[PDB]
């Protein structure tokens, strides 16, 4: 299997875990904790990925060649030229 | 004056094409909405709060769920990027 770390549940938490296992929602209190940590990691993994994405996007824009005046209508027109070629 | 990076233009065309799959018209409305939001920076340069988590002197102006990543220079505004915002915890 894998490595082990010992965790200390609070009185109110032990009570709620007990009902869940009894109701059959979970086989054991240890599996419920395993779910809780996995959910937390997913959240952290996502947040870290998104924060890193934006950090890289910024340096990417700065390094993406030289700036040009802003005209939206040119962009709106340029996009259509690629749509027609798609068909 | 307002200048944009080659990446930022690529963002808006990508954004436009995505919406254009559903309706080309709707894509025009959203990009128009983005522009109106960028042009507000000429009168209100600090509408977007500083975003040190993204870049040293980066700022971010919110349009929909997308961010207008920009920087302020002497005499002009530099539009760096337009990326989707940090995604919510909803999984």
Numbering used by the authors:
A (entry chain a): 3 to 89
B (entry chain A): 2 to 92
Paper text:
Our work focuses on the ParD-ParE family of toxin-antitoxin (TA) systems, which are often found on bacterial plasmids and chromosomes. Most TA systems include a stable toxin that can inhibit cell growth but that is normally bound and inhibited by a cognate antitoxin. ParE toxins likely restrict cell growth by targeting topoisomerases. The previously-studied ParD2-ParE2 and ParD3-ParE3 systems from the α-proteobacterium Mesorhizobium opportunistum are highly similar, with 41% (antitoxins) and 42% (toxins) identity.
Although our model for the toxin and toxin-binding region of the antitoxin (residues 43–89) were an excellent fit to the electron density, noisy electron density for the N-terminal portion of the antitoxin prevented adequate refinement of the entire structure. To produce a second model for the ParD2-ParE2 interface, we initially pursued truncated versions of ParD2 in complex with ParE2 but could not obtain crystals. Importantly, both structural and coevolutionary data suggest that there are no contacts between ParE2 and residues 1–45 of the antitoxin, and the modified structure was indistinguishable from the original structure in the overlapping regions. The ParD2*-ParE2 structure reveals a similar hydrophobic binding pocket to ParD3-ParE3 surrounding W60 and involving toxin residues A62, L73, and V91. Unlike ParD3 D61, which forms a salt bridge with R59 in ParE3, ParD2 I61 does not form a salt bridge. Substitutions of ParD3 residue 61 do not improve binding to ParE2, likely because ParE2 G59 provides flexibility to this region and space to accommodate almost any residue. ParD2 residue 64, which corresponds to the second library position, is leucine, and interacts hydrophobically with W60 (distance = 4.2 Å). Unlike ParD3 K64, which interacts with two glutamate residues, ParD2 L64 does not contact the toxin. Instead, ParE2 E89 forms an intra-chain salt bridge with R75. On α-helix-3 in ParD2*-ParE2, K80 forms a salt bridge with E12, analogous to the salt bridge formed by ParD3-ParE3 with E80-K12.
